[PDB]
Amino acid sequence: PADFVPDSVSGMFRSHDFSYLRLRPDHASRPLWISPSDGRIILESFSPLAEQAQDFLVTIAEPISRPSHIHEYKITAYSLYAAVSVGLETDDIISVLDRLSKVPVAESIINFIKGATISYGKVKLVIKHNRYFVETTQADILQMLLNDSVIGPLRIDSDHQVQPPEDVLEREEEDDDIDAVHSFEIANESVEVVKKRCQEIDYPVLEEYDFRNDHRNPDLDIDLKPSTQIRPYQEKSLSKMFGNGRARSGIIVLPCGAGKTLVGITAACTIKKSVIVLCTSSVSVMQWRQ
């Protein structure tokens, strides 16, 4: 498959015991209580940094319980990817959680958090001459691109070309990561192989969508008017999906019938390239259009 199971891997990390599990020394002085084995975060009223802790937990995971006294924590692989893309420091976040949470930080949970902080939503995909290449702003991205079977083996040793970046961008890697770093140009055949390798070796790359570098695609007959309705969840989802500069292909669950396609229309206008729209059924397609 060309996709990685980790996106829908949410629903685990909830199980513990009392013999092997020791009492967290921070339990004596801990405004919250991050239950690691259960994946929970019992952030009682004693937490003075409750807002920041809740923000960090919602980024990294999904807070299942939000009681009046204390909160709850749940594990979500998609939530883990979102937290990794959040940009917070992994070590600093772990230290803050250990300080606030009375329970000590679990080994498996700590390792998952550390992996998500850098690896999760932090893959390196360099670009040369405004295209997709095998590199990374960080050191890890460049090593992965060099060792990538499709990124490296299918990537030409030339560091970057404006024309190759516009046309060929090992296919047109418009879904690559930040460009203008140490990287080398790649061909225009097999992005399917590249993404298959990324999902197989579990490489969540912070992808973008360089629409202006989509030189092959002429700008389609798009009227870039945002006059359609905008909603708070809609605009925040747009902010999340557009990422930095160029947009990116992503997944966002939305309330259907509540202006779900509005953000999609806005993004399609934003890229100013060839876009198509799909709804459930053709009759439903007409109904949504009307």
Partner 1 sequence: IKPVFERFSSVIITSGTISPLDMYPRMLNFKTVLQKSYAMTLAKKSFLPMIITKGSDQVAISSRFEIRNDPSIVRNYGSMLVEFAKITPDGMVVFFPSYLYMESIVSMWQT
Please enumerate, by residue number, every residue annotated as part of a binding site: 254-261
Distance between CA atoms of 59 and 53, rounded to whole angstroms? Answer: 10
Residues 240-259 close enough to bind partner 1 by CB under 8 A: 242, 244
Task: Provide the token pair at 200.
Answer: 């197989």
Helices then strands, counting H and E runs in the chain, come out as 10, 2
Single-letter amino acid code for the residue at 160:
H
Radius of gyration for the chain, computed over Cα atoms and rounded to the nearest angstrom: 22
Q: Look-up: residue for tokens 């409750």?
A: 50
Distance between CA atoms of 184 and 165, rounded to whole angstroms? Answer: 10
Own/partner pairs for 275-279, CB < 8 Å, 24+ apart?
275/220, 275/222
Instruction: Find the binder of partner 1 among 239, 281, 282, 290 (CB under 8 A).
Output: 239
CB nearer to partner 1: pick between 187 and 269: 269
Do 116 and 90 meet the contact criterion of CB atoms below 8 Å apart? yes
CB nearer to partner 1: pick between 227 and 281: 227
Q: Which stretch binds partner 1 (CB under 8 A): 110-118, 152-160, 239-247, 281-289?
A: 239-247
Residue 227 is a binding residue for partner 1 (CB under 8 A): no
User: How far apart are CB 141 and partner 1 at their closest, in Å?
Assistant: 21
Q: Which residues are annotated as a binding site for ATP?
A: 254-261
Q: Which stretch binds partner 1 (CB under 8 A): 66-74, 154-162, 167-175, 238-246?
A: 238-246
Number of residues that bind partner 1 (CB under 8 A): 4
Residue 218 is a binding residue for partner 1 (CB under 8 A): no
Residue 226 is a binding residue for partner 1 (CB under 8 A): yes
Residues that bind partner 1 (CB under 8 A): 226, 239, 242, 244
